[model samples]
Target: KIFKPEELRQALMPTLEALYRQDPESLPFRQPVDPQLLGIPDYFDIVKNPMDLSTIKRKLDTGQYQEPWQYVDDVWLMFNNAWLYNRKTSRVYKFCSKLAEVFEQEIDPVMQSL
Candidate 1:
């Protein structure tokens, strides 16, 4: 507040010019990843619809996955864990709120079709 327009312009003009000169996406280095921990690729095409052993098996046959049962077991385990999270301790009461809506509202109901 004490400074005049010249000083403000002096700082702002240089910095703004530098920003314009920059490649916005430029980073000091390419961000690193360890391939071992890269995690599963998104399977939106398959998952956006219902998922069942049939779809899981289909993906596995295509080399898209390793084990169909792994997917199935994940659901069973999480749904069971949702129950294990317990009602009395705390959380919004809902069909599965204790697990923070374990089905995440986005993906659960459709999963039921399986």
Candidate 2:
């Protein structure tokens, strides 16, 4: 939670902008706008959608790490945006969480060191 607010803001900024763009008085409540739609390129574009793959390895094979931690960053933003806008939690949050956790434990150890 240290210095995470700004980090979170930047991550959620796009969704925030889109939320404000909505006509709040007219069915304003809905799911968070996707990162790809905003051209935010976080995890939505990278993470595969049809998760019905037969193999776990194949499932993991999706999403390029070249974007690296973008998935988690974007995911946190998505979830945060939903909370801020009082929107429903997305079904995809779990997938994003897993990716973030993987990077935290298997990639960016310094983050978890705290």
Candidate 3:
């Protein structure tokens, strides 16, 4: 589904805030750093997949897609890629969600101030 910025924010904000409250020190907005390079081998393997290449090329060529779906798909793809290409110890959802939580916390305060 396509969500407006407000709608998306509304859906994500609470969860993100909850996560941030739980651990503010290790998220995207605060650290703005890439997650520890886990699953590098798996990530490489996923990228090397023909289907992955085709989908990426299609997106680039058409630019006809839902942003939210695309975002979610991208996230899932990254996780799979990471797991396939790199080590197997990292969980993508956990890593990505933590990053999202960080971004939410970092922006929420600034947004409120504005």
Candidate 4:
């Protein structure tokens, strides 16, 4: 079966919202990263492509993703950037790691038949 843009958005939005709500108060992955203000000037140097939930949402709403897997790819990119920039022992790193685990659980079945 083929999936349309609206169909993908409708299916993925809940998973996206669940990710933000997972650690909304502290991690705040909803917004874009600010390297300078966050006291990590070299963040951009390490994280070549930074992504956030808000940006993903914008793309989803605007019909940029052509496939369901593309949406999953963006989510992984967001988590991967955090893993690449922060130390393994750091809280931010751990948060991303944990949240990514949750994402996998939530997203796996969604894309399985697609």
Which pairs clash (backbone N, Cα, C closer than 3 Å) in model 2?
Answer: 65-68
Can you write out model 4's per-residue Cα lDDT over 1-114, one digit (the tens) per residue? Answer: 667889888888888887877854226577899888888899888988889989999998989988888888998898889888878998888888888888888887777745
Off by over 4 Å in 2: 1-61, 87-114
| Candidate 3 local Cα displacement, residue 48, angstroms | 6.8
User: In terms of TM-score, how similar is model 2 to the real structure?
Assistant: 0.24
Measured with C-alpha atoms, the lDDT of residue 78 in candidate 3 is: 39
Top-scoring candidate (lDDT): 4
At residue 44, give the lDDT of candidate 4: 85
Regions more than 4 Å wrong, model 4: 24-26
**RMSD per model, one decimal:** 22.6, 15.4, 9.9, 1.8
| Model 3 misplaced regions, further than 4 Å | 13-67, 89-114
RMSD of 3: 9.9
Clash number for each model: 0, 1, 14, 0
Residue 105 of model 1 has an lDDT of: 43
Estimate every model's Cα lDDT from 0 to 1: 0.32, 0.36, 0.42, 0.83
RMSD over all Cα atoms, model 4: 1.8
Q: Relative to the unseen true structure, what is the C-alpha lDDT of residue 75 in candidate 4, on a scale of 0 to 100?
A: 89
Q: Give candidate 3's error at residue 105 in angstroms.
A: 20
TM-score of each: 0.24, 0.24, 0.33, 0.90
